[PDB]
Amino acid sequence: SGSMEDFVRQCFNPMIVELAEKAMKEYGEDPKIETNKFAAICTHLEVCFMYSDGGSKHRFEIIEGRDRIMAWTVVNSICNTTGVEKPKFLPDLYDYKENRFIEIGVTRREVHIYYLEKANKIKSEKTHIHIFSFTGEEMATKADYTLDEESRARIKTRLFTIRQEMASRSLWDSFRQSER
Ligand SMILES: O=c1cc(-c2ccc(O)c(O)c2)oc2c([C@@H]3O[C@H](CO)[C@@H](O)[C@H](O)[C@H]3O)c(O)cc(O)c12
Ligand SMILES: [Mn+2]
Ligand SMILES: [Mn+2]
């Protein structure tokens, strides 16, 4: 789906597109062939960055996007300084205000299905899950949404805009049905 490749390179900042290309090739996947997955990885990374800008200065440490050594440097450091237990898998963010790791989900499916999958693969009581969709729906652990409605609205409106531009290019149907 090379027209989706064109969309991704036009839609996302070059720093995001470059990181997503690297991430896919690390798993032997070709961004030029799995173009729907490339778009999905760019979207999740953009959401993670928008979320980290969503509250007070330095509220959040970003873990997603970092090379593995630096990501685990951030996590092991945080788990020595704040004493919070050590996750088995790298989470997306750490929230200094609530003293918890956050896992961010972005889904073309239903939020409840994706929430349960994240909860099950995580198996760690401490990690806060926040799920976004392209349709305006969000859902978070204990209905605790972490950010104010205005910052969440920026994220939800950004995902809608992406869905709308995909739809105008007849890319949305394939993209929505690509997720597994
Ligand atoms: O770097 C990666 C990061 C993640 C990823 C996904 C969700 C998160 O919440 C998350 O923190 C990280 O997913 C990747 C996937 C797949 O990306 C699909 C769409 O994001 C997912 O639906 C699939 O399950 C994934 O395997 C690849 O194929 C390749 C990759 O390099 C990556
Ligand atoms: Mn992640
Ligand atoms: Mn995530």
Author numbering: -2 to 53, 73 to 196
Lines quoted from the article behind this entry:
RdRP comprises the subunits PA (polymerase acidic protein), PB1 and PB2 (polymerase basic protein 1 and 2). Subsequently, the PA subunit cleaves the RNA strain approximately 10–13 nucleotides downstream from the 5′-cap to acquire the cap/primer. The PA subunit is a bridged binuclear metalloenzyme with an N-terminal domain (PA-Nter) harboring the endonuclease active site that carries out cleavage of the RNA segment. The active site is a negatively charged pocket that accommodates either Mg2+ or Mn2+ ions, with stronger affinity for the latter.
Using X-ray crystallography, we solved structures of the wild-type PA-N-terminal domain and its I38T mutant in complex with orientin at 1.9 Å and 2.2 Å resolution, respectively. Thanks to its high inhibitory potency and aqueous solubility, orientin (PDBe ligand USE) was soaked into the unoccupied protein crystals. The majority (0.8 occupancy) proximal ion was Mn2+, coordinated by four protein atoms (Nε2His-41, Oδ2Asp-108, Oε2Glu-119, O Ile-120) and two hydroxyl groups from the 3′,4′-dihydroxyphenyl moiety of orientin. The distal ion was coordinated by Oε2Glu-80, Oδ2Asp-108, the 4′-hydroxyl group of orientin, and three water molecules (W1, W2, W3). Ligands in both structures form a hydrogen bond with Oε2Glu-26 at the C-7 position. The previously observed high affinity of luteolin for PA-Nter is likely to be enhanced by the additional hydrogen bonding network surrounding orientin’s glucosyl moiety. This was observed in both protein variants, as most of the water molecules in the first solvation shell are located at similar positions. Wild-type Ile-38 moves orientin towards the solvent and differs from the mutant variant with an RMSD of 0.466 Å.
